[PDB]
Amino acid sequence: MDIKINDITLGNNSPFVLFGGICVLESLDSTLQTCAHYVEVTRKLGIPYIFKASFDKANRSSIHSYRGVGLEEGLKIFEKVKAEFGIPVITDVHEPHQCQPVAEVCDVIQLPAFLARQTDLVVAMAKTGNVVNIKKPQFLSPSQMKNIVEKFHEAGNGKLILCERGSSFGYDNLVVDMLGFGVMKQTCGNLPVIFDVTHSLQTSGGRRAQALDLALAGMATRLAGLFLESHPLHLLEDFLIRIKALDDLIKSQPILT
Amino acid sequence: MDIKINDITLGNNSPFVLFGGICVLESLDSTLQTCAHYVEVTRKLGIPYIFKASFDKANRSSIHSYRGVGLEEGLKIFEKVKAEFGIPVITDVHEPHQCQPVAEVCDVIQLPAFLARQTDLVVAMAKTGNVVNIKKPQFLSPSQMKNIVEKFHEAGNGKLILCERGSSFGYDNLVVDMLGFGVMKQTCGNLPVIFDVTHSLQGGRRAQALDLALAGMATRLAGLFLESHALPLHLLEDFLIRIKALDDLIKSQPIL
Amino acid sequence: MDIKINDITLGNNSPFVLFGGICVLESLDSTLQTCAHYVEVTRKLGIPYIFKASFDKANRSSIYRGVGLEEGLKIFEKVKAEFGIPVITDVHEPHQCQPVAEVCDVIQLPAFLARQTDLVVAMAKTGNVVNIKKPQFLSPSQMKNIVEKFHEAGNGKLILCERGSSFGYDNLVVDMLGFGVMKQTCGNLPVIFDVTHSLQTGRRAQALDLALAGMATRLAGLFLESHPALPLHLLEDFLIRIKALDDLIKSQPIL
Amino acid sequence: MDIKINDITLGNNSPFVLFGGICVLESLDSTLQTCAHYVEVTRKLGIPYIFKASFDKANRSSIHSYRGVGLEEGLKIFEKVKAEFGIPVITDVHEPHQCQPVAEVCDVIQLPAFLARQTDLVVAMAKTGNVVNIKKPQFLSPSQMKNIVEKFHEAGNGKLILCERGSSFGYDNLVVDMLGFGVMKQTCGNLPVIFDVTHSLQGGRRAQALDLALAGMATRLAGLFLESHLLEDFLIRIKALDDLIKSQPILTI
Ligand SMILES: [Cl-]
Ligand SMILES: [Mn+2]
Ligand code: NA
Ligand code: NA
Numbered sequence A: 001m002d003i004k005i006n007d008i009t010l011g012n013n014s015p016f017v018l019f020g021g022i023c024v025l026e027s028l029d030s031t032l033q034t035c036a037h038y039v040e041v042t043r044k045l046g047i048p049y050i051f052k053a054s055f056d057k058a059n060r061s062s063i064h065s066y067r068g069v070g071l072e073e074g075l076k077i078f079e080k081v082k083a084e085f086g087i088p089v090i091t092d093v094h095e096p097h098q099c100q101p102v103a104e105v106c107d108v109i110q111l112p113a114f115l116a117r118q119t120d121l122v123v124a125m126a127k128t129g130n131v132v133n134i135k136k137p138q139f140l141s142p143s144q145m146k147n148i149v150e151k152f153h154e155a156g157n158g159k160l161i162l163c164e165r166g167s168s169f170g171y172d173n174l175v176v177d178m179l180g181f182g183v184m185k186q187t188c189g190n191l192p193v194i195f196d197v198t199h200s201l202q203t204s205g206g207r208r209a210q211a212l213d214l215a216l217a218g219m220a221t222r223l224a225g226l227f228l229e230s231h232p233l234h235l236l237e238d239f240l241i242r243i244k245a246l247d248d249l250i251k252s253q254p255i256l257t
Numbered sequence B: 001m002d003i004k005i006n007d008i009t010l011g012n013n014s015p016f017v018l019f020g021g022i023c024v025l026e027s028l029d030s031t032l033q034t035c036a037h038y039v040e041v042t043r044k045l046g047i048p049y050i051f052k053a054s055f056d057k058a059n060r061s062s063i064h065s066y067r068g069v070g071l072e073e074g075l076k077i078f079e080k081v082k083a084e085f086g087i088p089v090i091t092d093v094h095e096p097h098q099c100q101p102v103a104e105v106c107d108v109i110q111l112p113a114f115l116a117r118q119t120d121l122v123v124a125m126a127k128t129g130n131v132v133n134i135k136k137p138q139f140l141s142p143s144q145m146k147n148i149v150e151k152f153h154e155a156g157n158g159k160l161i162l163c164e165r166g167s168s169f170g171y172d173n174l175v176v177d178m179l180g181f182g183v184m185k186q187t188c189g190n191l192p193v194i195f196d197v198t199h200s201l202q203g204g205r206r207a208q209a210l211d212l213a214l215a216g217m218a219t220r221l222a223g224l225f226l227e228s229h230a231l232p233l234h235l236l237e238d239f240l241i242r243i244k245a246l247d248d249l250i251k252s253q254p255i256l
Numbered sequence C: 001m002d003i004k005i006n007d008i009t010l011g012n013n014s015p016f017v018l019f020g021g022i023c024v025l026e027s028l029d030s031t032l033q034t035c036a037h038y039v040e041v042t043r044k045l046g047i048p049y050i051f052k053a054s055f056d057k058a059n060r061s062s063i064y065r066g067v068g069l070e071e072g073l074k075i076f077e078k079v080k081a082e083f084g085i086p087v088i089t090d091v092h093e094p095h096q097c098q099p100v101a102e103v104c105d106v107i108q109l110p111a112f113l114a115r116q117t118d119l120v121v122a123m124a125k126t127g128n129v130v131n132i133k134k135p136q137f138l139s140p141s142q143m144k145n146i147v148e149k150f151h152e153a154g155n156g157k158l159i160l161c162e163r164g165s166s167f168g169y170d171n172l173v174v175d176m177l178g179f180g181v182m183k184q185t186c187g188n189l190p191v192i193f194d195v196t197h198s199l200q201t202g203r204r205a206q207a208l209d210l211a212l213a214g215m216a217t218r219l220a221g222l223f224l225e226s227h228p229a230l231p232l233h234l235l236e237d238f239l240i241r242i243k244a245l246d247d248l249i250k251s252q253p254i255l
Numbered sequence D: 001m002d003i004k005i006n007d008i009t010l011g012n013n014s015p016f017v018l019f020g021g022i023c024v025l026e027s028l029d030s031t032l033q034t035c036a037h038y039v040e041v042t043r044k045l046g047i048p049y050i051f052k053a054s055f056d057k058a059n060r061s062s063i064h065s066y067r068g069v070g071l072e073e074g075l076k077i078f079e080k081v082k083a084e085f086g087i088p089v090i091t092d093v094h095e096p097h098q099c100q101p102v103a104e105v106c107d108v109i110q111l112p113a114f115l116a117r118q119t120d121l122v123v124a125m126a127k128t129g130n131v132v133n134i135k136k137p138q139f140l141s142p143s144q145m146k147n148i149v150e151k152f153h154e155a156g157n158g159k160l161i162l163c164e165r166g167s168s169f170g171y172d173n174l175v176v177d178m179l180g181f182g183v184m185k186q187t188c189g190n191l192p193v194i195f196d197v198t199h200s201l202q203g204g205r206r207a208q209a210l211d212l213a214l215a216g217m218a219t220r221l222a223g224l225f226l227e228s229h230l231l232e233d234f235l236i237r238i239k240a241l242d243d244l245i246k247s248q249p250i251l252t253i
Helices: A028-045 A070-085 A096-105 A119-128 A142-154 A180-187 A207-219 A235-252 B029-045 B071-085 B096-105 B119-126 B142-154 B180-187 B197-201 B204-217 B233-251 C028-045 C069-083 C094-103 C117-125 C140-152 C178-185 C203-215 C232-251 D028-045 D071-085 D096-103 D119-126 D142-154 D180-187 D205-217 D230-246
Strands: A003-005 A008-010 A017-024 A049-054 A089-092 A108-111 A131-135 A160-164 A193-196 A225-228 B003-005 B008-010 B017-024 B049-054 B089-092 B108-111 B131-135 B160-164 B193-196 B223-227 C003-005 C008-010 C017-024 C049-054 C087-090 C106-109 C129-133 C158-162 C191-194 C221-227 D003-005 D008-010 D017-024 D049-054 D089-092 D108-111 D131-135 D160-164 D193-196 D223-225
Touching: A017 A028, A028 A049, A028 A070, A028 A235, A049 A070, A070 A089, A070 A096, A096 A108, A096 A119, A108 A119, A119 A142, A131 A142, A142 A160, A142 A180, A160 A180, A180 A193, A180 D205, A193 A207, A207 A225, A207 A235, A207 D180, A207 D205, A235 D230, B017 B029, B029 B049, B029 B071, B029 B233, B049 B071, B071 B089, B071 B096, B096 B108, B096 B119, B108 B119, B119 B142, B131 B142, B142 B160, B142 B180, B160 B180, B180 B193, B180 C203, B193 B197, B193 B204, B197 B204, B197 B223, B204 B223, B204 B233, B204 C178, B204 C203, B233 C232, C017 C028, C028 C049, C028 C069, C028 C232, C049 C069, C069 C087, C069 C094, C094 C106, C094 C117, C106 C117, C117 C140, C129 C140, C140 C158, C140 C178, C158 C178, C178 C191, C191 C203, C203 C221, C203 C232, C221 C232, D017 D028, D028 D049, D028 D071, D028 D230, D049 D071, D071 D089, D071 D096, D096 D108, D096 D119, D108 D119, D119 D142, D131 D142, D142 D160, D142 D180, D160 D180, D180 D193, D193 D205, D205 D223, D205 D230
Parallel strands: A017 A049, A017 A225, A049 A089, A089 A108, A108 A131, A131 A160, A160 A193, A193 A225, B017 B049, B017 B223, B049 B089, B089 B108, B108 B131, B131 B160, B160 B193, B193 B223, C017 C049, C017 C221, C049 C087, C087 C106, C106 C129, C129 C158, C158 C191, C191 C221, D017 D049, D017 D223, D049 D089, D089 D108, D108 D131, D131 D160, D160 D193, D193 D223
Antiparallel strands: A003 A008, B003 B008, C003 C008, D003 D008
């Protein structure tokens, strides 16, 4: 099942969509700077693109640490991004009250992994009728995603994306199970599946070589999109050039059975 | 480091405290009946006892399964439990705004595992000055607990309990790392460590609960955290007799 | 199922048996010294005792790998003469089995080798009591598969030895629920706990906590290593505490 | 580092090599039949191929499962496979004393995962001077493979292949860490790394094997290893991906 997000077709047999931007909104200008860069690279490579940012940092290094620009200011910034660039955007929500107002502005709203089992937040997101991205918890098996899908469905919203992030592997480590993508497709009605390679990397080319190998491996399984929380060199375009080459090949192969 | 909860001394070298009760407050009369049974059995054996329930169950099986009685009625039930039985009570909080009204009533407030890294909530909990139970997420290593403890300390609250609930072991399964209790003690200032046997799990379930509880308590812990209907309620006395035996043995010998 | 090993009764509802000794045999004199200590401590504590050592470290690097086989057996012969106790050692090759078995009362299947069907059969054939080291990669519900091979090869005197489970990379965890699973699915054969190898990744403190936790689940035995590994001088104090707990658990009816 | 196996070049920047065949050797006629199938499909696609079988499999699922035709007849069968098809062959050994006579015939000799730490076998295998396939145990971290490599090096043989088989993931399940390949390359001197997709496992089974193989090969590997129409369609897909990947240079650093 494909999902239309404006002029973008997101699905598991469509050209991959890049979800990318920044961790936590800080200022208007450094936001537009970052998004202009993604847009420029994705445009020239021909890759559909959705800008990502949070307005709030939920887990902070200190009780005193910077927290982000918050909802009201956050939403202002998003509104600007859409105006300037004419692209979709995606952000996470943490509170049911937040859902409708965020959804007025943000094309896709995201269920944080830690909140994935919070029924209140599920219901309130569903009710917006917006496209929803479900961050698969590291502690949840691919087989359980169907249970989250069922709740959203029951709550009246079937416009759901499933987003791989890795799985708990002993203490403080993650592993990505490449078979999980297929399990999710098969059990969740072939909803779009996307791969958050960045957050999968708990833990040649160093880290850049790692991200590349892992991103290539996941996209080889035929996925709707790739989700980056970040990555004189042009590191982004080098990366994407290779992802696009593999994705174009994969998506040109007929599906078996 | 010990914590006083009314007339109870909670600590890793003290007689174990039972944190026991039910999942979700759904009723008054039934809650009181269940509590009565825990009270009678624990009093009979001289085990210190804190009644546990949630008024607002976060992760429901379905979108419309009953979430519980809610904050206002829930606190009223806790008030009745405290008045009737003279025991402390423990409940979880999900939002900063809930912290004050819950803490005014409840002796221990609980940080759910899924919110354990939600700074806003941590700070709001700290600031109540209440005794706090920190539920360890299944995906967090024991060495990471110190980071939560630090955040509480920064925010002015040192009355903290760490609660073990197992660790993710491949898909779906949980394992309890018996070594983790010690790592928590050694890195978190020998704060009270308690073991949630019920949520660490998943004569079948009963025989597993007993083996697992005994194994945990053999490591020298402050308390044991369980839920009944979940242990069958009528077998509570037998279960506790066995836990007490082991706890009394272990605690009676000095640390080696 | 209980298993008689000379005058020792080994079983999950019997007083725990200590399987103790050292990583590897290096000399006669050091072996007899370490054994002497184990025997005197266990005798006064009233704990049944089986001496453990390997004659070969088959997975090291390459010079000690130990005094090797021919010499090893010599030393085991001495140990048995002097102290009148049973002994246990591991075999890594099928041909080793029968000659090792003439001397050593319990023979051990190494964890890495549990799927080696020629070794299983050769071990089984000896008719000796067998200690099966549970592989780090094998679930407790699959121990039954190794048991079945031994049964089908005509030996039912099997001990199941927990040694921890793979947990991510380079770490182990001991699943305290595993003991019960093994009991229920493997016909209540003696289950023992290798606390030493489980600890692979203070030590004195973590070993005691881990050993107490396992024995709390009602086991036939404890399997451990010292060096002059628990510090040897601590063995008596360590064992006092293990016995204390074992005695309590074993006094409590099942169910 | 590349390894030459007769006319084949095996290496992480070379077209992938297929390792495949039968579980255990039964008979000459049986072996030739199966081998011819692999040969026809691989030749038709231009994929280098090495025939795999055991002559004495020591880790089968029952005690009385057939272990194969044995050393003497096995080696006679391997000789005939080599002569008939002009391809290399690979077989496992589990006893030190087997190594020399096996190495007379078999181009590649394979260290079973369960013996990977067994020094005596490692030394006896090394001393053959043959190409060696090291099966990575499911309990061994990818950064530990360097220790095995070192033991082979000490014993005088560096013609080593590393074979991924997956990693213990809780109980029973195996997961393949796609990052482990890179770790092995980095720490083991860019020795050829191959992927045993079949073991790694336990649409259907087929759809899975496809996804998992494609994922591994996307990381740039010397070969694909298969345990116990269809083979053609699979290999077409692997080759497409492999050709694409291998034809691009490594990241600019
Ligand atoms: Cl760039
Ligand atoms: Mn040892
Ligand atoms: Na209070
Ligand atoms: Na593992």
